[PDB]
């Protein structure tokens, strides 16, 4: 059903590897109550298998919030 | 007391940096360094050198005058 609907409606339709740079941006603003920090490294692409173990690695580091009961 | 975190209050200042492994340790060392050295030398040569030039003049005169003093005086041995 979806395929025939697409053929009905969507038939009338038309037929740069980025460079990771180690750097920093510091927006110093002492008026803000809390400091936000985000630190990253060059990761893999979507098709790279290494995405699977790396997520596991992140799962080991985990996440925390002040409202967590753990 | 004196630690990063409470030294001063600064707002709305954005700083951009680069990894030391992404940049050259000697960027334009001579193309821009040499003109900069000349600028710094020119700004200071008329405030540092003149006092030392006076010392050299005094040093030369003192050395010469001391030599002349030890030299024989012909008039003293006249008659």
Give which of A54, A24, A17, A53 is closest to A39, Cα–Cα: A24
Q: What share of chain A is helix, strand, coil (3-state, %, to 5)?
A: 25, 10, 65
The set of residues, in sequence order, having a beta carbon less than 8 Å from that of A26 and lying 6+ positions away, is B14, B15, B17
Half-sphere exposure of A10 (CA within 13 A, CB side): 6
The backbone torsions φ and ψ at residue A49, rounded to the nearest 5 degrees and listed phi first, read: -60, -30
Q: Tell me if chain B has a CB within 8 Å of the CB of A26.
A: yes
Which of B4, B6, B7, B12 to mutate to test binding with chain A, by most A CBs within 10 Å of its CB? B12
How far is Cα A33 from Cα A51, in angstroms, rounded to an integer? Answer: 35
Contact B10, A30 (CB under 8 A): yes
Give which of A16, A40, A63 is closest to B19, Cα–Cα: A40
Contact A28, B10 (CB under 8 A): yes
Alpha helix segments (H runs only) across chain B: 33-70
DSSP one-letter string for A30-60:
TTSSS-----------SS-TTHHHHHHHHHH
Contact B15, A28 (CB under 8 A): yes
Contact B19, A23 (CB under 8 A): yes
Place of tokens 């409202």: A67
Contact A38, A48 (CB under 8 A): no
Nearest CB neighbour to A29, from listed B12, B17, B22: B12
CB pairs under 8 A between A and B: 35
């Amino acid at each position: 059903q979806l395929l025939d609907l697409a053929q009905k409606h969507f038939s009338s339709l038309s037929g740069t590897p980025c460079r990771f740079t180690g750097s920093e941006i510091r927006h110093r603003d002492d008026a803000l109550p809390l400091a936000h920090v985000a630190i990253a490294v060059e990761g893999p692409g979507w098709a790279n298998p290494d995405n699977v173990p790396l997520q596991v690695a992140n799962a080991i580091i985990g996440h925390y919030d002040s409202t967590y009961g753990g | 007391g004196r630690e990063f975190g409470h030294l001063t209050r600064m707002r709305h200042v954005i700083t951009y940096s680069l990894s030391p492994f992404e940049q050259r340790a000697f960027p334009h060392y001579f193309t821009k360094g040499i003109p900069n050295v000349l600028r710094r030398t020119r700004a200071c040569i008329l405030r540092v050198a003149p006092p030392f030039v006076v010392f050299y003049l005094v040093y030369t005169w003192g050395t010469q005058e001391f030599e002349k003093s030890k030299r024989k005086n012909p008039a003293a041995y006249e008659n």
